[PDB]
Symmetry: D2
């Protein structure tokens, strides 16, 4: 029975099964781990403390309607509140996203979003505690592209608090090198 928790986007048309009964699956809009979302956290706590799942994959995707909607900033109603976390992420990386041509930002934000969600998952009390008590647990952030059908392990792979901080830092720095 299952060995991977995958956290993926609700509007991704590639299923996690296809892009990988190994799988325990959470999906939400823009593949978020929000610090205080009982729904995702519950899932994570069950996967780690009960099922002893040893890999968590957060998978984003290009051409993601949740990302595009966080960026366009329309009055969508309740979902805007959900998407504000992604807006906080755009402004965390505002200088970086402003250098790019505007048809290119969404795909940058999509990758940055994945790194930030991994960083959040790694910071939950649940994952911190598992790493502190010796439990073998790895986090991964991937981004999938259906323009291709293909994948990028998005620079973020973490196996301890140490490797989370480092791999988070370097993913962002690797994303800050710009294709002319």
């Amino acid at each position: 029975t299952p060995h991977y928790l995958v956290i993926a986007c609700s509007d991704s048309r590639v299923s996690p099964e296809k892009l990988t009964g190994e799988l325990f699956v959470h999906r939400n809009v823009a593949n978020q781990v929000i610090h205080t979302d009982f729904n995702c956290l519950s899932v994570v706590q069950y996967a780690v403390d009960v099922l002893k799942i040893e890999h968590i994959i957060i998978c984003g995707h290009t051409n993601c309607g949740g990302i595009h909607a966080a960026m366009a900033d329309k009055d969508l109603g309740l979902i805007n509140n959900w998407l504000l976390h992604i807006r906080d992420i755009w402004f965390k990386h505002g200088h970086l996203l402003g250098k790019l041509s505007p048809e290119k930002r969404a795909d940058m934000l999509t990758k940055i979003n994945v790194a930030e969600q991994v960083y959040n998952l790694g910071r939950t009390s649940i994952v911190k505690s598992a790493w502190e008590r010796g439990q073998k647990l790895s986090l991964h952030g991937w981004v999938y592209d259906v323009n291709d059908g293909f994948l990028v392990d998005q620079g973020v792979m973490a196996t301890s608090r140490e490797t989370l901080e480092i791999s988070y830092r370097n993913a962002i720095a690797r994303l800050s090198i710009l294709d002319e």
Copy 2:
């Protein structure tokens, strides 16, 4: 582009994409719609108000870990709180479920659970408002090699269809009685 929102369980072996790009998908433990879950409510509000999705399917499944875990009631930690809503639904139907033999109880609760979550979904401000302003929106509760319920198209048919599912489930087959 998407025409269906599927709310399904995180431990389900099968992709909701059994049954491609017509699906918008939310997965959580025991396929719940909790009145006040920002995560599931956000998905529903976006599907309905923004994407104009005209069908919401809550799809449960038999041999559900989350259902079993809610009944075993061990100290699992945080997930126990999430599963408390499942234990409320168990006690709402305690006389019913006690009339089954032990080994049949899980699969009944799985079925009851779907009906209850459809009732919740239909009582959201999101869905009630969409029906009140004439939007076409149908809700479905299914249980997943076949798909074995509840079907709503308005607040009156939600009430009808929920009460019928429960009465229908209250009628016990000999092979299930204790």
Copy 3:
């Protein structure tokens, strides 16, 4: 420093300080402990596991706008979702509430609501665990009346899972005896 967590209503005009720096305070609409509300649960977990607060009081009040709004069933918007938990409580006790004259139901629902929130608090993983590991912890449900300025310890006092189940049962049964 503090020895009581009080959970009270956001629209109550009597403050918990007055009706009791002893106090750590949570307030929300209709003084709820909802199973999966990270906000209240957080508070409870901190009070019990960190501050080692030994008493939790849930205090309701008569003439409570949250209760009245759950009962009238207007399209209020987002808050209706919050108040649905209270609607589930009305229907848990529908036969009992139908016997009463309609000008009397709200005050009955207010008291029943308090018993149900205590029962929920007692069922959290946090409180179950504290009782299981020997920690001294008492729960109380009170209802305050500003028609009077006065109090009723609403039949629900709990110090273990055992006393929670019992005291919950008897509170409801005591509330089911009707004043002709």
Copy 4:
């Protein structure tokens, strides 16, 4: 009947009712407005849309346990997750805070925190919509024997007032620098 919503901290010694039946009150740990907290959002939506409350006050306080706990970063369990939003705000202002001496850092974060939570409140769909439809609504961020900030009346003045509070807080008194 009520004219003020007060969002204050659960560990505050003083009743928000220092400063009677004019107050509708929400209390949580470190007086947060988290974008997706159903509890606080519900209160705000009811105050604004239903009770027609024209003022929202986020009132923080010095010597705040929740702020201290977020900075100490011990393994407290569930509450750590709630306090993570506070640590995000710390790191958003990491260069600022690192320029203070250690024993002054808490009280700066308390002040920053209020400003950040007012910014959150002003960016809610609830508040943005109320401003967009012309409703009179002002937001305030205060820190509590005196009341030592941010004041918003529209989305443009929210932006102005938030940026000014942060720049104003960035100007360091000699007695606070390290």
